[PDB]
Amino acid sequence: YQHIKVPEGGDKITVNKDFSLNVSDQPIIPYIEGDGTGFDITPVMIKVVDAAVEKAYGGKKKIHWMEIYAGEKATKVYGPDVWLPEETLQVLKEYVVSIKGPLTTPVRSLNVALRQELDLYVCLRPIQYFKGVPSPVREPEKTNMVIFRENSEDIYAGIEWAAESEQAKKVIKFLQEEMGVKKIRFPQTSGIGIKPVSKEGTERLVRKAIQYAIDNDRKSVTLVHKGNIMKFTEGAFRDAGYALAQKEFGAELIDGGPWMKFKNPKTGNEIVVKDSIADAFLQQILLRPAEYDVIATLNLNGDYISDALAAQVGGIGIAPGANLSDSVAMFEATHGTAPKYAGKDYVNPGSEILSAEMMLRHLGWTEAADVIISAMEKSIKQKRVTYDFARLMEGATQVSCSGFGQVLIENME
Amino acid sequence: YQHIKVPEGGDKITVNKDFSLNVSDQPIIPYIEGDGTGFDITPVMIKVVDAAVEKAYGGKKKIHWMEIYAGEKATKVYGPDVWLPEETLQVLKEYVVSIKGPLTTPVRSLNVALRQELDLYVCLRPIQYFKGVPSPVREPEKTNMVIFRENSEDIYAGIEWAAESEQAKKVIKFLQEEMGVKKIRFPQTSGIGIKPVSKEGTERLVRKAIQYAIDNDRKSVTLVHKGNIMKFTEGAFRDAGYALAQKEFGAELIDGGPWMKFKNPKTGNEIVVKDSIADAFLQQILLRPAEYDVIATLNLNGDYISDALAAQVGGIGIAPGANLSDSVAMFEATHGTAPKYAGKDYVNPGSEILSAEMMLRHLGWTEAADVIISAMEKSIKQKRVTYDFARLMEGATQVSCSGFGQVLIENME
């Protein structure tokens, strides 16, 4: 490669024909530092993960970290305006499992570009409440959910044209004259965006959500959509999701529908497949959080829901996330780059750390992942935490970003 | 008219050239019963409003209610599939100020149809916390906001085609071949929706929001958008909103932008015009609710935000709303028709009652509106409330829908 150094003491992860992974005791894991606060967080994440791997496996296993480049640091290494090097994309695919810090874009989203170029069609966002975390809501412990957000289509496709541009004028002309569209209120000054939602995109996402409910013995899968206004996109997501539940999982209607249920083939438990209109859902996650579990939704809805839920559990700064295809997994910090805090060793490294926890569990290294959860639980209860938590607690000891890393490692004992 | 009886003892409201209203002591007010629970709520609203008007003005003023028809009741009066009679639309325009219960649609939204046909481009949703109301959040009293939701464009235009339909095939073909679109992930099975957002639609909505902040001495106007992914629609809303603030209200940048500020010409106070990305905004309304006041946003975002906020303050069942143009005002219950509760005198009439409170204030009858607020405040504190509140309170006296009407009227003394 041009600027990538492959660790010679490591082994490349390989994907079996059934999509299971071959992970050695010495796997290579590519990482992207991230813009801004990625500078502060990345070394702390690596140190914490290495410590957890050491604790769980007594030195037999070790991660061989391989730096690859995206965003500002990529432009510095590769040259002006090389924000996403071709070889970064190739390595992400070839080495299978990776982790990234936050990315920005100069004045389309590099984050979205990664998900789309690599066809990482699942955005996976677990929502859990850690005891002792200050929350804006009365009963945050009642929230335990897993969001499956569709990552490859919807209005996130980036298909749009600016008002009064020749391209926008042409599309509006087509819509008015060829399609007979009369519903554009102000055609003279309208920007136009396109929203594609497919049976194929819906089905692969919903399949993953339902299979996750089976594999992890979850109670329900809720299809979240705004299908009463967007009948042929959001409504179609709902329709195809229910159809797949019926066909592939043998779900049957509850009281003539629209909800369904089937028996978990691995545990025997009942799994309800239901649906919520997106606006109502934002109400019900607050009012009746215990009624929801696995969520399957579209790209835009998933964005809003994931953020609302992270806020609800007081976890804005520690929300983990993954972007998955059948054969590539990229784990990520879920917050912004926070440029005014960059280099100041101040922000919470918890998000990338818990995304690394997800990564370890994906590798089959569940023992090491459990070590991280234990450390996090203990550190929060001790109130030895970064400013973002400390400020909302009583009697807390405020620590630096790297300092929180040290607190976590201590709490692995 | 075919089936409308004009009260001969009433006077038609008229609109002056400056859009101010000429309202007599005996104005005619059209009302739509509403589907489902509209049967239960409507008579109670009328009784409560009449009592408030009596209390404030000692019999000098009286509303002359005029029933007009929409939804199921319209089909019964006018004939099969006449869901929105032409004369209903004509009367709503001609009589200026009206109130409606909830509407459904047979298996596009009659509610949306009304807003679009009458060009009621502002959806106005006040968000306030009533002392004593059970809320899911720790500090509901910190939420006091007014949502200006754009009502005439966005993905609510209803411009869409079903997957694999000849129309969808044609649009996708156009996009691929003529516009060079490559970003449709699954063109074979994609439904397509169109999202129009205009400078003209943005400007008239934002103008109303900023003028409201001036007239009511509010602290700030926040433009809420997802303009980092939808650059030419949601981003254009942001851009045009800021431009209008600068041009029409003399706003100037804070620290080189993007936020702005100007002096209220009526009170002298500073008004900040700022912006929030929609996903972040759903976090910040929970975490820092006191930082937000007047909100200006698009159709879809406004829908989600209005519902989330109503839930936050424990006001899902008492959230008032108005749909306004420069010359027509339609006040509405904001909940669904709840068919399994219809005819059972059980649901909360508070939403339509507080929408009527807004209606009275729009008529210039602020004294009568204040009577309703007083009654509502007192009734809630007494815990003499409908089941939806009673169940979440301790030591409450559960009353029927009509029973709550009586409690309110008692509390006008």
Tab-separated table of N, CA, C and O in Angstrom, chain B residues 234-326:
chain	number	residue	atom	x	y	z
B	234	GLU	N	-33.847	20.724	3.210
B	234	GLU	CA	-33.778	21.089	4.622
B	234	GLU	C	-32.736	22.186	4.851
B	234	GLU	O	-32.995	23.152	5.569
B	235	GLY	N	-31.574	22.052	4.207
B	235	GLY	CA	-30.522	23.073	4.265
B	235	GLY	C	-30.952	24.417	3.696
B	235	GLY	O	-30.594	25.464	4.243
B	236	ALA	N	-31.720	24.374	2.606
B	236	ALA	CA	-32.301	25.566	1.982
B	236	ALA	C	-33.316	26.275	2.884
B	236	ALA	O	-33.414	27.503	2.863
B	237	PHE	N	-34.068	25.497	3.668
B	237	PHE	CA	-34.975	26.045	4.685
B	237	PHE	C	-34.152	26.865	5.678
B	237	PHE	O	-34.497	28.006	6.002
B	238	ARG	N	-33.050	26.281	6.146
B	238	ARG	CA	-32.147	26.967	7.067
B	238	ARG	C	-31.603	28.260	6.451
B	238	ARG	O	-31.669	29.322	7.073
B	239	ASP	N	-31.080	28.153	5.228
B	239	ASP	CA	-30.468	29.289	4.528
B	239	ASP	C	-31.447	30.447	4.317
B	239	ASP	O	-31.127	31.596	4.624
B	240	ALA	N	-32.635	30.140	3.806
B	240	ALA	CA	-33.655	31.160	3.538
B	240	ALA	C	-34.227	31.772	4.815
B	240	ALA	O	-34.580	32.955	4.839
B	241	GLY	N	-34.328	30.960	5.868
B	241	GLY	CA	-34.802	31.444	7.162
B	241	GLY	C	-33.877	32.488	7.762
B	241	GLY	O	-34.332	33.534	8.234
B	242	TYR	N	-32.576	32.201	7.739
B	242	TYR	CA	-31.561	33.140	8.212
B	242	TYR	C	-31.535	34.412	7.350
B	242	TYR	O	-31.456	35.527	7.876
B	243	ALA	N	-31.624	34.240	6.032
B	243	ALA	CA	-31.617	35.377	5.100
B	243	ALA	C	-32.780	36.339	5.360
B	243	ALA	O	-32.598	37.559	5.332
B	244	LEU	N	-33.963	35.782	5.621
B	244	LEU	CA	-35.152	36.573	5.940
B	244	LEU	C	-35.009	37.320	7.263
B	244	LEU	O	-35.443	38.464	7.376
B	245	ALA	N	-34.410	36.664	8.257
B	245	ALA	CA	-34.140	37.286	9.552
B	245	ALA	C	-33.280	38.538	9.380
B	245	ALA	O	-33.561	39.586	9.967
B	246	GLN	N	-32.249	38.411	8.549
B	246	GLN	CA	-31.323	39.496	8.249
B	246	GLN	C	-32.031	40.639	7.519
B	246	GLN	O	-31.920	41.801	7.921
B	247	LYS	N	-32.780	40.293	6.474
B	247	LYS	CA	-33.411	41.274	5.588
B	247	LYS	C	-34.582	42.024	6.221
B	247	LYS	O	-34.626	43.258	6.186
B	248	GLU	N	-35.528	41.275	6.784
B	248	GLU	CA	-36.803	41.836	7.230
B	248	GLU	C	-36.788	42.307	8.679
B	248	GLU	O	-37.585	43.163	9.063
B	249	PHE	N	-35.882	41.751	9.479
B	249	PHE	CA	-35.847	42.031	10.913
B	249	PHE	C	-34.518	42.633	11.396
B	249	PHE	O	-34.351	42.920	12.588
B	250	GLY	N	-33.585	42.831	10.467
B	250	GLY	CA	-32.303	43.473	10.759
B	250	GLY	C	-31.401	42.700	11.702
B	250	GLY	O	-30.614	43.296	12.444
B	251	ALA	N	-31.516	41.373	11.674
B	251	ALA	CA	-30.679	40.499	12.490
B	251	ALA	C	-29.215	40.561	12.061
B	251	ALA	O	-28.906	40.646	10.870
B	252	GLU	N	-28.316	40.530	13.042
B	252	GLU	CA	-26.883	40.486	12.761
B	252	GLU	C	-26.201	39.298	13.424
B	252	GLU	O	-26.625	38.845	14.489
B	253	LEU	N	-25.148	38.804	12.773
B	253	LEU	CA	-24.451	37.583	13.176
B	253	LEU	C	-23.862	37.659	14.577
B	253	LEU	O	-23.384	38.711	15.006
B	254	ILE	N	-23.909	36.528	15.277
B	254	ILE	CA	-23.249	36.371	16.567
B	254	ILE	C	-21.927	35.642	16.338
B	254	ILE	O	-21.914	34.490	15.887
B	255	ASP	N	-20.823	36.331	16.633
B	255	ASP	CA	-19.461	35.793	16.488
B	255	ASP	C	-19.175	35.195	15.103
B	255	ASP	O	-18.591	34.113	14.991
B	256	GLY	N	-19.594	35.904	14.057
B	256	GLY	CA	-19.373	35.460	12.680
B	256	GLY	C	-20.303	34.351	12.217
B	256	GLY	O	-20.082	33.748	11.164
B	257	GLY	N	-21.340	34.075	13.006
B	257	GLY	CA	-22.387	33.129	12.615
B	257	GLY	C	-22.204	31.707	13.120
B	257	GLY	O	-21.197	31.397	13.763
B	258	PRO	N	-23.167	30.818	12.804
B	258	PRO	CA	-24.299	31.104	11.920
B	258	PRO	C	-25.484	31.791	12.608
B	258	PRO	O	-26.368	32.302	11.923
B	259	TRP	N	-25.488	31.813	13.941
B	259	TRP	CA	-26.591	32.399	14.711
B	259	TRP	C	-26.656	33.916	14.539
B	259	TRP	O	-25.688	34.543	14.105
B	260	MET	N	-27.805	34.493	14.877
B	260	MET	CA	-28.042	35.927	14.729
B	260	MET	C	-28.839	36.472	15.904
B	260	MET	O	-29.408	35.710	16.688
B	261	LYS	N	-28.888	37.797	16.013
B	261	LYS	CA	-29.722	38.457	17.013
B	261	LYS	C	-30.260	39.801	16.532
B	261	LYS	O	-29.636	40.468	15.707
B	262	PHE	N	-31.434	40.172	17.035
B	262	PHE	CA	-32.016	41.493	16.787
B	262	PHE	C	-32.851	41.961	17.983
B	262	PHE	O	-33.250	41.152	18.822
B	263	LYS	N	-33.098	43.267	18.053
B	263	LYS	CA	-33.901	43.862	19.119
B	263	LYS	C	-35.387	43.836	18.772
B	263	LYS	O	-35.790	44.289	17.696
B	264	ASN	N	-36.187	43.299	19.691
B	264	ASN	CA	-37.640	43.355	19.601
B	264	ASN	C	-38.082	44.819	19.518
B	264	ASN	O	-37.844	45.587	20.452
B	265	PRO	N	-38.714	45.215	18.395
B	265	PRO	CA	-39.109	46.619	18.220
B	265	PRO	C	-40.257	47.066	19.132
B	265	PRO	O	-40.513	48.269	19.249
B	266	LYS	N	-40.927	46.111	19.775
B	266	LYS	CA	-42.090	46.402	20.618
B	266	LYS	C	-41.777	46.421	22.114
B	266	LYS	O	-42.449	47.120	22.879
B	267	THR	N	-40.769	45.655	22.530
B	267	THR	CA	-40.412	45.541	23.949
B	267	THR	C	-38.967	45.944	24.252
B	267	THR	O	-38.646	46.288	25.393
B	268	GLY	N	-38.104	45.888	23.241
B	268	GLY	CA	-36.691	46.239	23.404
B	268	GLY	C	-35.765	45.064	23.671
B	268	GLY	O	-34.541	45.205	23.597
B	269	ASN	N	-36.347	43.903	23.975
B	269	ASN	CA	-35.575	42.698	24.290
B	269	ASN	C	-34.862	42.081	23.086
B	269	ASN	O	-35.303	42.223	21.944
B	270	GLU	N	-33.750	41.406	23.359
B	270	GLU	CA	-32.978	40.704	22.341
B	270	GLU	C	-33.680	39.398	21.955
B	270	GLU	O	-34.154	38.659	22.821
B	271	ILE	N	-33.754	39.138	20.651
B	271	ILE	CA	-34.263	37.868	20.130
B	271	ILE	C	-33.167	37.193	19.309
B	271	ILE	O	-32.683	37.755	18.320
B	272	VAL	N	-32.770	35.997	19.739
B	272	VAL	CA	-31.758	35.210	19.040
B	272	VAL	C	-32.444	34.370	17.968
B	272	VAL	O	-33.453	33.713	18.239
B	273	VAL	N	-31.909	34.413	16.754
B	273	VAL	CA	-32.321	33.479	15.708
B	273	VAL	C	-31.180	32.487	15.491
B	273	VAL	O	-30.084	32.858	15.059
B	274	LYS	N	-31.446	31.226	15.817
B	274	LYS	CA	-30.429	30.181	15.764
B	274	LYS	C	-30.938	28.960	14.994
B	274	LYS	O	-32.049	28.981	14.466
B	275	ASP	N	-30.109	27.923	14.900
B	275	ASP	CA	-30.507	26.678	14.232
B	275	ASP	C	-29.979	25.430	14.943
B	275	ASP	O	-28.925	25.469	15.590
B	276	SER	N	-30.732	24.338	14.810
B	276	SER	CA	-30.353	23.026	15.329
B	276	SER	C	-30.595	21.945	14.282
B	276	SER	O	-31.618	21.958	13.588
B	277	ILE	N	-29.650	21.015	14.161
B	277	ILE	CA	-29.855	19.837	13.326
B	277	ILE	C	-30.915	18.984	14.018
B	277	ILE	O	-30.883	18.833	15.244
B	278	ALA	N	-31.848	18.440	13.238
B	278	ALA	CA	-33.060	17.826	13.796
B	278	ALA	C	-32.808	16.678	14.764
B	278	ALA	O	-33.511	16.559	15.763
B	279	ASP	N	-31.815	15.839	14.476
B	279	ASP	CA	-31.523	14.716	15.368
B	279	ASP	C	-30.960	15.209	16.707
B	279	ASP	O	-31.407	14.760	17.770
B	280	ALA	N	-30.017	16.150	16.646
B	280	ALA	CA	-29.490	16.799	17.853
B	280	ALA	C	-30.592	17.514	18.635
B	280	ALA	O	-30.601	17.496	19.872
B	281	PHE	N	-31.525	18.137	17.917
B	281	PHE	CA	-32.608	18.883	18.559
B	281	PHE	C	-33.476	17.981	19.442
B	281	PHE	O	-33.913	18.395	20.519
B	282	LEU	N	-33.705	16.749	18.993
B	282	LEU	CA	-34.501	15.794	19.771
B	282	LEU	C	-33.778	15.404	21.056
B	282	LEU	O	-34.421	15.009	22.029
B	283	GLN	N	-32.449	15.511	21.048
B	283	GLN	CA	-31.660	15.322	22.266
B	283	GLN	C	-31.749	16.557	23.166
B	283	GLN	O	-32.016	16.453	24.367
B	284	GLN	N	-31.524	17.730	22.579
B	284	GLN	CA	-31.455	18.957	23.352
B	284	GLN	C	-32.776	19.399	23.992
B	284	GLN	O	-32.760	20.042	25.038
B	285	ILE	N	-33.913	19.058	23.383
B	285	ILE	CA	-35.216	19.355	24.018
B	285	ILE	C	-35.400	18.600	25.339
B	285	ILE	O	-36.098	19.074	26.239
B	286	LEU	N	-34.753	17.442	25.455
B	286	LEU	CA	-34.756	16.680	26.707
B	286	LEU	C	-33.723	17.203	27.695
B	286	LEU	O	-34.019	17.404	28.884
B	287	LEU	N	-32.508	17.426	27.201
B	287	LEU	CA	-31.363	17.723	28.054
B	287	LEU	C	-31.272	19.192	28.469
B	287	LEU	O	-30.864	19.501	29.598
B	288	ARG	N	-31.648	20.097	27.568
B	288	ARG	CA	-31.582	21.535	27.856
B	288	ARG	C	-32.832	22.282	27.359
B	288	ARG	O	-32.716	23.216	26.554
B	289	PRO	N	-34.031	21.879	27.845
B	289	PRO	CA	-35.299	22.427	27.343
B	289	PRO	C	-35.452	23.939	27.530
B	289	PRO	O	-36.140	24.581	26.735
B	290	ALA	N	-34.821	24.502	28.564
B	290	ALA	CA	-34.947	25.937	28.834
B	290	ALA	C	-34.271	26.831	27.780
B	290	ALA	O	-34.531	28.038	27.724
B	291	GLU	N	-33.419	26.236	26.942
B	291	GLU	CA	-32.681	26.981	25.913
B	291	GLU	C	-33.484	27.238	24.632
B	291	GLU	O	-33.014	27.948	23.739
B	292	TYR	N	-34.686	26.664	24.547
B	292	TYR	CA	-35.514	26.749	23.334
B	292	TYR	C	-36.876	27.378	23.599
B	292	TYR	O	-37.443	27.226	24.683
B	293	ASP	N	-37.390	28.087	22.598
B	293	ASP	CA	-38.596	28.879	22.760
B	293	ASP	C	-39.505	28.736	21.536
B	293	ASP	O	-40.284	27.792	21.452
B	294	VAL	N	-39.410	29.662	20.586
B	294	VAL	CA	-40.152	29.512	19.334
B	294	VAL	C	-39.327	28.629	18.395
B	294	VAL	O	-38.121	28.807	18.277
B	295	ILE	N	-39.991	27.662	17.769
B	295	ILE	CA	-39.348	26.748	16.822
B	295	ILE	C	-39.956	26.971	15.442
B	295	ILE	O	-41.180	27.074	15.310
B	296	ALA	N	-39.102	27.081	14.422
B	296	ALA	CA	-39.564	27.134	13.034
B	296	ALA	C	-38.972	25.936	12.314
B	296	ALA	O	-37.755	25.753	12.308
B	297	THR	N	-39.825	25.110	11.717
B	297	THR	CA	-39.333	23.887	11.089
B	297	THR	C	-40.211	23.441	9.934
B	297	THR	O	-41.272	24.034	9.670
B	298	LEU	N	-39.750	22.399	9.246
B	298	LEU	CA	-40.444	21.851	8.095
B	298	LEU	C	-41.599	20.941	8.536
B	298	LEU	O	-41.790	20.679	9.734
B	299	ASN	N	-42.369	20.480	7.557
B	299	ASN	CA	-43.574	19.698	7.787
B	299	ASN	C	-43.295	18.401	8.550
B	299	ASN	O	-43.834	18.187	9.646
B	300	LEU	N	-42.415	17.560	8.006
B	300	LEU	CA	-42.137	16.276	8.657
B	300	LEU	C	-41.460	16.428	10.026
B	300	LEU	O	-41.895	15.818	11.013
B	301	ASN	N	-40.400	17.232	10.089
B	301	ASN	CA	-39.716	17.483	11.363
B	301	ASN	C	-40.683	18.002	12.418
B	301	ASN	O	-40.644	17.562	13.568
B	302	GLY	N	-41.555	18.930	12.006
B	302	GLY	CA	-42.539	19.532	12.906
B	302	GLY	C	-43.488	18.508	13.487
B	302	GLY	O	-43.843	18.576	14.666
B	303	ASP	N	-43.901	17.560	12.654
B	303	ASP	CA	-44.758	16.468	13.098
B	303	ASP	C	-44.102	15.698	14.253
B	303	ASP	O	-44.693	15.538	15.329
B	304	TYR	N	-42.870	15.249	14.024
B	304	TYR	CA	-42.116	14.474	15.010
B	304	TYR	C	-41.875	15.275	16.293
B	304	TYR	O	-42.109	14.778	17.406
B	305	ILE	N	-41.442	16.522	16.126
B	305	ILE	CA	-41.076	17.391	17.245
B	305	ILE	C	-42.290	17.706	18.121
B	305	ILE	O	-42.219	17.604	19.353
B	306	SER	N	-43.401	18.062	17.477
B	306	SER	CA	-44.633	18.414	18.185
B	306	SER	C	-45.112	17.262	19.066
B	306	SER	O	-45.528	17.477	20.207
B	307	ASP	N	-45.050	16.043	18.531
B	307	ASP	CA	-45.478	14.859	19.266
B	307	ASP	C	-44.530	14.524	20.416
B	307	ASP	O	-44.973	14.243	21.527
B	308	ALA	N	-43.227	14.560	20.142
B	308	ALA	CA	-42.217	14.312	21.171
B	308	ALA	C	-42.386	15.284	22.340
B	308	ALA	O	-42.368	14.878	23.512
B	309	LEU	N	-42.578	16.561	22.019
B	309	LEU	CA	-42.710	17.595	23.053
B	309	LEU	C	-43.998	17.449	23.867
B	309	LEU	O	-43.973	17.580	25.101
B	310	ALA	N	-45.114	17.164	23.195
B	310	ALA	CA	-46.381	16.931	23.910
B	310	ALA	C	-46.227	15.782	24.903
B	310	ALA	O	-46.703	15.871	26.032
B	311	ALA	N	-45.540	14.717	24.484
B	311	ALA	CA	-45.287	13.572	25.363
B	311	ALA	C	-44.464	13.984	26.591
B	311	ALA	O	-44.791	13.608	27.725
B	312	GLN	N	-43.430	14.788	26.340
B	312	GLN	CA	-42.468	15.246	27.346
B	312	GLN	C	-43.142	15.967	28.516
B	312	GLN	O	-42.775	15.775	29.676
B	313	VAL	N	-44.112	16.820	28.192
B	313	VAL	CA	-44.825	17.594	29.225
B	313	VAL	C	-46.048	16.867	29.797
B	313	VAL	O	-46.850	17.465	30.521
B	314	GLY	N	-46.195	15.585	29.468
B	314	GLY	CA	-47.353	14.805	29.903
B	314	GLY	C	-48.665	15.242	29.264
B	314	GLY	O	-49.736	14.954	29.798
B	315	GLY	N	-48.579	15.909	28.108
B	315	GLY	CA	-49.736	16.541	27.473
B	315	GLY	C	-50.227	15.924	26.177
B	315	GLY	O	-50.868	16.609	25.376
B	316	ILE	N	-49.952	14.630	25.992
B	316	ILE	CA	-50.359	13.884	24.801
B	316	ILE	C	-51.856	14.048	24.485
B	316	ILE	O	-52.255	14.087	23.311
B	317	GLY	N	-52.668	14.133	25.542
B	317	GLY	CA	-54.129	14.199	25.420
B	317	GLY	C	-54.752	15.582	25.525
B	317	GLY	O	-55.973	15.728	25.383
B	318	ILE	N	-53.925	16.601	25.774
B	318	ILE	CA	-54.411	17.977	25.918
B	318	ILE	C	-53.638	19.007	25.088
B	318	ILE	O	-53.746	20.201	25.341
B	319	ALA	N	-52.878	18.537	24.100
B	319	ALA	CA	-52.096	19.408	23.221
B	319	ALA	C	-52.992	20.150	22.225
B	319	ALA	O	-53.656	19.511	21.424
B	320	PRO	N	-53.017	21.498	22.280
B	320	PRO	CA	-53.859	22.243	21.342
B	320	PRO	C	-53.119	22.497	20.023
B	320	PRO	O	-51.897	22.321	19.950
B	321	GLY	N	-53.853	22.922	18.997
B	321	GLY	CA	-53.233	23.190	17.698
B	321	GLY	C	-54.121	24.042	16.824
B	321	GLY	O	-55.343	24.049	16.994
B	322	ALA	N	-53.491	24.762	15.894
B	322	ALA	CA	-54.175	25.589	14.909
B	322	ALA	C	-53.510	25.390	13.552
B	322	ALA	O	-52.311	25.106	13.479
B	323	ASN	N	-54.303	25.516	12.490
B	323	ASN	CA	-53.781	25.599	11.125
B	323	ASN	C	-54.179	26.960	10.577
B	323	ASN	O	-55.372	27.279	10.514
B	324	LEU	N	-53.183	27.773	10.229
B	324	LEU	CA	-53.419	29.174	9.861
B	324	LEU	C	-52.867	29.555	8.487
B	324	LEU	O	-51.773	29.132	8.111
B	325	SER	N	-53.650	30.336	7.744
B	325	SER	CA	-53.142	31.146	6.640
B	325	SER	C	-53.216	32.609	7.083
B	325	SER	O	-53.518	32.897	8.243
B	326	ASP	N	-52.953	33.544	6.177
B	326	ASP	CA	-53.088	34.951	6.545
B	326	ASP	C	-54.548	35.333	6.839
B	326	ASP	O	-54.802	36.265	7.601
